[PDB]
Design a protein around this nucleic acid. Sequence first.
RNA 1: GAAGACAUUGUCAGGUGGGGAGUUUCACAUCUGUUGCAGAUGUCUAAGGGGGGCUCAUGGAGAACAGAAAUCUCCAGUAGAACAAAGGGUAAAAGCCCCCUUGAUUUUGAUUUUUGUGAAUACAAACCAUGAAAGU
RNA 2: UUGACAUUGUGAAGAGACAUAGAGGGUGUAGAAUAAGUGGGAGCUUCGGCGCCAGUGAAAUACCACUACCUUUAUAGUUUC
RNA 3: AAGCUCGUAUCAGUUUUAUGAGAUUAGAGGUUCCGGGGUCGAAAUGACCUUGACCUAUUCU
Lengths: 61, 261, 177
Amino acid sequence: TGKKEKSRRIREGRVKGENFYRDSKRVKFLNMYTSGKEIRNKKGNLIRAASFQDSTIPDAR
Amino acid sequence: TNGKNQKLNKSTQAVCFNLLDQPDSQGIWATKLTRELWRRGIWDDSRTVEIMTQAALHQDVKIVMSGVMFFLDLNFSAIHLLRDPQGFAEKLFKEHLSGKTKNKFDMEQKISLMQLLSRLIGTHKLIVLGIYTFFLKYLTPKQRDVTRIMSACAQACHDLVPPEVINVMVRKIADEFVSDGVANEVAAAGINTIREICSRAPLAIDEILLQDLVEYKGSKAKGVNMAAKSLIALYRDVAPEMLKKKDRGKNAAMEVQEAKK
Amino acid sequence: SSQVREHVKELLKYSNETKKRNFLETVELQVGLKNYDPQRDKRFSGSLKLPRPNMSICIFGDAFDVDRAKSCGVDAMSVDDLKKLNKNKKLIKKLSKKYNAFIASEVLIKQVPRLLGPQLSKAGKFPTPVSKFQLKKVLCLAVAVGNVLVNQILMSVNFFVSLLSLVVKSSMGPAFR
RNA sequence: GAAGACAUUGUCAGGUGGGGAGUUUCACAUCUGUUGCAGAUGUCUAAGGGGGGCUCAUGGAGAACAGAAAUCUCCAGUAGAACAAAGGGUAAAAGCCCCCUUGAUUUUGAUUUUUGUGAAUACAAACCAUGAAAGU
RNA sequence: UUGACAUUGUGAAGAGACAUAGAGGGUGUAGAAUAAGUGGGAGCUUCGGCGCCAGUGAAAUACCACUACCUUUAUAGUUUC
RNA sequence: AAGCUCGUAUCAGUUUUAUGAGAUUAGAGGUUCCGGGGUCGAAAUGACCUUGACCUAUUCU
């Protein structure tokens, strides 16, 4: 019971992967090594382009 | 823990007293310790507040500041264990700020002394009358961090002081903050620190300048408008006859119409 | 109730058991109740009252007031019956302490703090214009109600609970709860 | 021999337990912290009615101290002023001042926005305010 | 793993607490003195010692009531260890 | 797809006619009485010394 994230957050004071290790800030940094990736549906076509690959021509004024 | 060992506390308060006598710096280890024990709730006693009073009345700056920051921490319950708050404030204002004009404290410490004096005064209905001319040197918008000084000016106002010595203050502020050409923040600060004076001392500015200040209702700047509306709503419930018919808002005017006959 | 009446009756008989200490025994009520903490500012104040305090008041005034209140049997004072007193703190404190209360004209309650400033404001007897039961720091609170009139006791008690054991007493008499 | 009403054994109740199982992946701005912040104080969240009188902004000329701006007088001035910043509407006013009031009141139904309300809208009876009145 | 109950019987000696009945207390400094504090005030008097009027002190002491804390005395019983 | 009130004349991817809708003070100097140095000062709200920020006169709309 003491080894639960609930009890830890209570005794101390969100993102997937916050443990006794690896706070908020650290999880985002470590996810960089993986999820520069390209999302697709089951038939195959772009839902969400990869990071820094948005492919929209902005209004450059 | 179980019971308070008075034989020990009364003994180790005597060493704090006998340290604060040594005028070099050695009362640091009395002040820094008594603050900790007060915060831990171990030394809630009248004998201890005297130690920090003597520290505030000391000559060393880092001891006087320890005492002042203790009595600050909006103040804490230690004020309700003092032996004479009026004489305390009088001795402080006489020794540190005005008396010798030694010019030891910097502005950041003078402001913290002012805060303590005004917050004691407003809370306990004190009368010194030198405060209100000491503020006037520092009540200029060309001065260093005046928003703290003027926020303590109001805190030393009462229902029970001669409003002329506050009229001079209000007419200094009005001459130097809501005059011709002044900026929006400056004028809004002036009006905001005048209305929270008048919330304690209502008959400290007369109708003729009240009207001059409610001029600024529709001021297009959104600081001065929010400020003037506060003064109007303050005198709508207190002395609505000073306001003109245009400002008496549907109930002050009705109360005056029934009570004027 | 008339359980007050049986108390006050043989208090008035105690009136005639240890008769006189060559003065008059005032009547007092001591309030005792719980459930409140005055170290927090839970303050109360009310002055909706009417006695015989062997009336000893000091009115400050002007020419228009001193010859008004030379009748009346009252101690009176000029403005410079006060101006020539500030030089001595214990002198200005002795008059402080002399009188049960203070009053003054509508003109002089702008000038009185420049003269009698530190005193007369913490003492809780500051003057009041002409033409109390403060919960300062304690749970104990006693008030003088009358003299040697059972109505006054209840009259004050309902006001005290209005504001929020009860005891009635005289100068040397016993306590009646 | 040792030990002894404790240990043990039985049932409950807390703790630990990836060793193992299953599973998922509304506002300007003084007063405390993270960085130039989310938070705490206090501080705005707003005078409508119906009668009268009068014209505003700005510019020009002119008057001791008085000047670019202090008060006074005259001329021009369709709004360039104000009415909760480049826009509509308003000039014997929808604006400023003055007089009187507080219809920002109840009852009965009708319409638009909108099936839920609220909002606005007109409509009749009463108590009322206002002006000499029409009328509101 | 730690606690309670049961198994679980026969004896003894001690410590703490409930609960009542009591008993007394207060040095920051000045002040005759060690001032919880508050409110009534100028003697019940064995003494007129004294209380009032006199300093000094935020607060003034006799006399009598209130209701805060602190520390101790005893065990009808109550229990725990 | 199954039908049921009845068989009017109302309708129409159409036409016609009328009619509405910001930065620059170098040049002058005054202050900071919280930034004070300087020979001096038992002692001083000073001779003056600079860092300054301050109130200023300029330019565009």
